[PDB]
């Protein structure tokens, strides 16, 4: 049985509105309804991994797992295995995988983050799961962010607290937050960003929705505008939205949006919005293709409609050579040459790098760079040709060209990371000096850039 080089991943997000689901929810897992939908001819083909995020979930873990497994069994005739389930309050993540994947999946981690302080601590936050699938790390975050049209900044703060504090993936990657720990990271949930138009325009918005004319509404979607202004979700992707707003419906139909202020809403309007979203971030030059992104039309127990997204994701095999794991392969080397970091910091400490990668036996710490002033105010940290030659565990090009080097630039004075980034080894050539580049972030915000040249030697 050959190991796969591609899998498909189902991501679902549904704010259940504290109500039990209807007896049939198969449309969700089939990516049928509105938007970018899945071909009927694929209905019996199981996805490799199903990741289900709920919010306002009233069910027990046992009750929901029985509904999910039954649903998938009815669709596919496959009995899925439970990889992980984690619940914080009424926020839940379930990961299911085809039984043939059970021995391919390892290093399963779960965690949660509670957002807010005192008043604002008690029902919003995130749950997450990570694991290895053969040689590929996968992370999944289901977040229920702060509600209300006038709280986009709070949502952005919730996002930063979740990516800082959610402890998933390899703990040895200590300078790196979840936005750098995984080959593929999927972030989804009731992100609660709204269509930011005047209250008076509610009926106009509803009209536009009935005409399937989303352009003048998406131009006011807070998640798209905040992302465009680099306020949130920097370096994440989202498929184009081609489905109607998923919130806020009258229950038991989808014919009516319930937007008017009520005591039950705290006297807030809920103009129709795309609250329910799926975003991703994959390491550079890894295959990831969105094959569906839409909402169901026939599941009406909640004031939200379920959202689905599906992905092709590249994966690699668990490589063994005669040498590594457990020694270096002297036929392999990575040289980072004429490299410099451009930092936005106004500090004047010395800086060093750390190189982290599962292609190394352990992380590598450089000597200090030489600080210079840029012409527009910036700190430039020069490394010249002083960086350590990296000795990968396996030199085979079919392994090494699929790997990535995480880079942290750290203060000599404090050992704290000022910036994190990632470089692909999927080069156009080996034994050749080639340009490399990564932005650097810290707490998911842009803090600088790293650029220079790489020279990769493989056994070919």
Which residues make up the interface to ligand T0Y (CB under 6 A)? 224, 227-228, 237, 369-370, 382-384, 386
Residue 318 bridge partners (DSSP): none
Shortest Å distance, C-beta 384 to ligand T0Y: 3
CA distances from 84 to 42, 51, 94, 248, 280 (A): 26, 9, 6, 30, 20
Torsion of CA 294, 177, 359, 412, to 10 degrees: 150
b (16+ CB within 10 A) / e for 351-383: bbbbbbbbbbeebbebeebeeeeeeeebbbbeb
In the three-class reduction of DSSP (H, G, I as helix; E, B as strand; rest coil), residue 22 is classed as coil
Judging by DSSP bridges, how do beta strands 307-314 and 288-295 pair with one another? antiparallel
CA neighbor of 367 nearest in space, from 312, 409, 317 = 409
In the three-class reduction of DSSP (H, G, I as helix; E, B as strand; rest coil), residue 289 is classed as strand
Between 61 and 196, whose beta carbon lies closer to ligand T0Y?
196
Between 228 and 346, whose beta carbon lies closer to ligand T0Y?
228
Between 198 and 384, whose beta carbon lies closer to ligand T0Y?
384
Between 341 and 393, whose beta carbon lies closer to ligand T0Y?
341
Shortest Å distance, C-beta 407 to ligand T0Y: 15
Contact 149, 269 (CB under 8 A): yes
Shortest Å distance, C-beta 2 to ligand T0Y: 33
Between 165 and 236, whose beta carbon lies closer to ligand T0Y?
236
CA distances from 209 to 37, 179, 231, 260, 389 (A): 18, 34, 27, 17, 57
Shortest Å distance, C-beta 101 to ligand T0Y: 30
Most distant CA pair in the chain, distance: 70
Between 181 and 281, whose beta carbon lies closer to ligand T0Y?
281
Q: What 8-state DSSP symbol labels residue 239?
A: P
Shortest Å distance, C-beta 159 to ligand T0Y: 14
CA 185 to chain centre: 3
CA neighbor of 196 nearest in space, from 210, 217, 213 = 217
d(CA 334, CA 340): 16
The residue of the chain with the least Cβ separation from ligand T0Y equals 384
Shortest Å distance, C-beta 279 to ligand T0Y: 10
Shortest Å distance, C-beta 221 to ligand T0Y: 10
Between 28 and 383, whose beta carbon lies closer to ligand T0Y?
383
Judging by DSSP bridges, how do beta strands 136-144 and 184-190 pair with one another? parallel
d(CA 259, CA 269): 5
Shortest Å distance, C-beta 33 to ligand T0Y: 24
Shortest Å distance, C-beta 164 to ligand T0Y: 21
CA distances from 150 to 28, 91, 154, 155 (A): 30, 23, 9, 10
Shortest Å distance, C-beta 368 to ligand T0Y: 7
Half-sphere exposure of 33 (CA within 13 A, CB side): 27
Between 106 and 219, whose beta carbon lies closer to ligand T0Y?
219
Between 397 and 439, whose beta carbon lies closer to ligand T0Y?
439
Between 224 and 328, whose beta carbon lies closer to ligand T0Y?
224
């Amino acid at each position: 049985q050959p190991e796969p080089d591609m899998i498909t991943i189902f991501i679902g997000t549904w704010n259940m509105g504290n109500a039990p689901p209807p007896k049939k929810i198969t449309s969700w897992f089939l990516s049928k309804g509105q938007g970018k939908t899945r071909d009927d001819s694929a209905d019996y083909i199981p996805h490799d991994i199903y990741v289900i995020g709920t919010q306002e979930d009233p069910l027990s873990e046992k009750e929901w797992l029985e509904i999910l497994k039954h649903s998938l069994q009815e669709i596919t005739s496959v009995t899925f295995k439970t990889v992980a389930i984690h619940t914080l309050w009424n926020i839940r993540i379930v990961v299911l995988a085809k039984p043939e994947h059970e021995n391919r999946i390892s290093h399963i981690c779960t965690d949660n983050v509670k957002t807010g302080i005192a008043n604002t601590l008690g029902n919003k936050g995130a749950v997450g799961v990570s694991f290895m699938f053969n040689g590929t790390s996968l992370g999944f975050v289901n977040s229920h962010l702060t509600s209300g049209s006038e709280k986009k900044l709070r949502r952005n703060q919730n996002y930063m607290n979740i990516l800082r504090f959610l402890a998933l993936g390899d703990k040895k990657l200590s300078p790196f937050n979840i936005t750098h720990r995984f080959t593929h990271l999927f972030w989804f949930g009731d992100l609660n960003y709204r269509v930011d138009l005047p209250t008076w325009e509610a009926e106009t918005i509803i009209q536009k929705i009935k005409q399937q004319q989303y352009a003048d509404l998406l131009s006011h979607d807070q998640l798209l505008t905040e992302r465009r202004e680099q306020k949130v979700f920097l370096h994440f992707e989202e498929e184009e939205i081609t489905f109607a707003p998923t919130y806020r419906f009258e229950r038991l139909t989808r014919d009516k949006y319930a937007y008017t202020k009520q005591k039950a809403t705290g006297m807030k309007y809920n103009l129709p919005s795309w609250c329910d979203r799926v975003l991703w971030k994959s390491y550079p030059l890894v295959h990831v293709v969105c094959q569906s992104y839409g909402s169901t039309s026939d599941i009406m127990t909640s004031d939200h409609s379920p959202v689905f997204a599906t992905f092709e994701a590249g994966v690699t095999s668990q490589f063994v050579s005669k040498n590594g794991p457990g020694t270096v392969d002297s036929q392999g080397q990575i040289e980072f040459l004429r490299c410099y970091a451009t930092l936005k910091t106004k500090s004047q400490t010395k800086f060093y790098l750390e190189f982290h990668s599962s292609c190394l036996e352990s992380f590598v710490k450089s000597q200090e760079g030489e600080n210079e002033e840029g012409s527009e105010g910036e700190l430039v940290v020069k490394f010249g040709e002083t960086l350590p030659k990296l000795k990968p565990i396996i030199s085979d090009p079919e392994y090494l060209l699929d790997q990535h080097i995480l880079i942290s630039i750290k203060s000599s004075d404090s050992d704290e990371s000022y910036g994190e980034g990632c470089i692909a080894l999927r080069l156009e050539a080996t034994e050749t000096q080639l340009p490399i580049y990564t932005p650097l972030t810290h707490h998911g915000e842009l803090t600088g850039h790293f650029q220079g040249e790489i020279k990769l030697q493989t056994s070919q």
